[PDB]
Write an enzyme that holds these catalytic residues in place. Structure first.
Site, short mmCIF file in Angstrom:
data_model
loop_
_atom_site.label_atom_id
_atom_site.label_comp_id
_atom_site.label_asym_id
_atom_site.label_seq_id
_atom_site.Cartn_x
_atom_site.Cartn_y
_atom_site.Cartn_z
N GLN A 17 3.79 1.48 2.79
CA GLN A 17 3.20 0.44 3.87
C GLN A 17 3.78 -0.80 3.40
OE1 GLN A 17 -0.76 0.49 4.95
NE2 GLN A 17 -0.49 -1.48 6.35
N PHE A 52 1.49 10.80 1.45
CA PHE A 52 1.04 10.18 2.96
C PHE A 52 2.19 9.18 3.35
CE2 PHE A 52 -2.45 7.05 4.90
CZ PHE A 52 -1.93 7.45 6.35
N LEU A 95 -2.21 10.27 13.13
CA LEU A 95 -1.93 8.98 13.70
C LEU A 95 -1.34 9.01 15.00
CD1 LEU A 95 -0.65 7.42 10.21
CD2 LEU A 95 -2.84 7.58 11.14
N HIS A 143 -0.60 4.78 16.16
CA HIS A 143 0.42 3.99 15.74
C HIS A 143 1.72 4.06 16.37
CE1 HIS A 143 -1.75 2.69 12.21
NE2 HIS A 143 -2.81 3.68 12.50
N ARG A 176 1.02 -1.29 -0.08
CA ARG A 176 -0.09 0.24 -0.02
C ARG A 176 0.83 1.38 0.03
NH1 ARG A 176 -3.24 -0.20 4.67
NH2 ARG A 176 -5.41 -0.75 3.46
N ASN A 194 -1.13 -1.23 11.93
CA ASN A 194 -1.94 -1.81 12.90
C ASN A 194 -3.34 -2.15 12.51
OD1 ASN A 194 -3.65 0.06 14.14
ND2 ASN A 194 -1.72 0.63 15.23
N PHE A 209 5.20 1.29 8.26
CA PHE A 209 5.01 2.32 7.16
C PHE A 209 6.17 3.30 7.36
CE2 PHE A 209 2.57 5.64 9.44
CZ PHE A 209 2.02 5.00 10.45
C1 LIG Z 1 -5.35 4.14 4.12
O1 LIG Z 1 -4.12 3.66 5.15
C2 LIG Z 1 -4.64 4.02 6.28
C3 LIG Z 1 -5.66 5.14 6.57
C4 LIG Z 1 -5.62 5.44 8.18
C5 LIG Z 1 -4.95 4.94 9.09
C6 LIG Z 1 -3.75 4.21 8.57
C7 LIG Z 1 -3.52 3.71 7.35
C8 LIG Z 1 -2.52 2.93 6.97
C9 LIG Z 1 -1.18 3.63 6.43
C10 LIG Z 1 -0.71 3.94 7.91
C11 LIG Z 1 -0.77 2.67 8.36
N1 LIG Z 1 -2.18 2.10 8.13
C12 LIG Z 1 -2.48 0.76 8.75
O2 LIG Z 1 -1.82 0.46 9.72
C13 LIG Z 1 -3.89 0.72 8.26
N2 LIG Z 1 -4.36 -0.66 8.79
C14 LIG Z 1 -3.92 -1.74 8.12
O3 LIG Z 1 -3.34 -1.98 7.18
N3 LIG Z 1 -4.17 -2.98 8.76
C15 LIG Z 1 -3.71 -4.18 8.29
C16 LIG Z 1 -3.15 -4.83 9.25
C17 LIG Z 1 -3.10 -6.22 9.74
C18 LIG Z 1 -2.41 -6.86 10.67
C19 LIG Z 1 -1.52 -6.08 11.43
N4 LIG Z 1 -0.63 -6.76 12.31
C20 LIG Z 1 -1.09 -4.89 10.98
C21 LIG Z 1 -1.97 -4.22 10.03
#
Ligand SMILES: COc1ccccc1[C@H]1CCCN1C(=O)CNC(=O)NCc1ccc(N)cc1
Length: 164
Positions: A62, A59, A121, A125, A54, A101, A112
């Site tokens: 990831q 931004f 965040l 995070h 991603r 997460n 990321f």
């Molecule tokens: C569109 O991406 C986001 C939008 C708002 C907040 C956070 C994000 C993305 C980019 C920054 C980090 N982020 C996340 O962590 C989004 N959550 C994610 O991808 N979850 C899947 C996941 C599954 C298991 C584990 N251990 C970690 C993440």
């Protein structure tokens, strides 16, 4: 001192160069140690061969789902998930290294690298390091993303490890 680790990254099989990261073990030792060991591969698994799945311009980039290679997976050296260590470090600008997460206390291996200050965040995070060298590589990765996060090139961590 704090660990220095590296990621060597390809796009469509062409090397982009090296991203060097300082891991702030002074502040977040458990989170830093997880990332360090996943870079060396010393537990028998880790980031080598995994992708940036991603990437969103202006931004972040990831990566780190080395189990499902689709953004739902990854695992830590401790077990499948581990707690949020603290929120002491903030998402202050480009180059910040932080844990992805799925809600509180769901750190695994996904991470990321920010390409902007992502203050929204903070407190959600766990920030655990920053880019020492190779923001040019990060900007290349970023340029292969899209608004939806879908990458337009296959972005692979071909090699990774610990420098010090
Ligand atoms: C569109 O991406 C986001 C939008 C708002 C907040 C956070 C994000 C993305 C980019 C920054 C980090 N982020 C996340 O962590 C989004 N959550 C994610 O991808 N979850 C899947 C996941 C599954 C298991 C584990 N251990 C970690 C993440």
């Amino acid at each position: 001192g704090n660990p220095l680790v590296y990621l060597d990254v390809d796009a469509n099989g062409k090397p982009l160069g090296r991203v060097v990261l300082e891991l702030k073990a002074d502040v977040v030792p458990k989170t830093a140690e997880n990332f360090r060991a996943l870079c060396t591969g010393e537990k028998g698994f880790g980031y080598k061969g995994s992708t940036f799945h991603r990437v969103i311009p202006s931004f972040m980039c990831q990566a780190g789902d080395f189990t499902n290679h689709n953004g739902t997976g990854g695992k830590s050296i401790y077990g499948s998930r581990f707690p949020d260590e603290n929120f002491t470090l903030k998402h202050v600008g480009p180059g910040v290294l932080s844990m992805a997460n799925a809600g509180p206390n769901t750190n695994g291996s996904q991470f990321f690298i920010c390409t902007i200050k992502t203050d929204w965040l903070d407190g959600k995070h766990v920030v655990f390091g920053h880019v020492i060298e190779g923001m040019d590589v990060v900007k290349k990765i970023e340029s292969f993303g899209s608004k939806s996060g879908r990458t337009s090139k296959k972005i692979v961590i071909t090699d990774c490890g610990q420098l010090s």
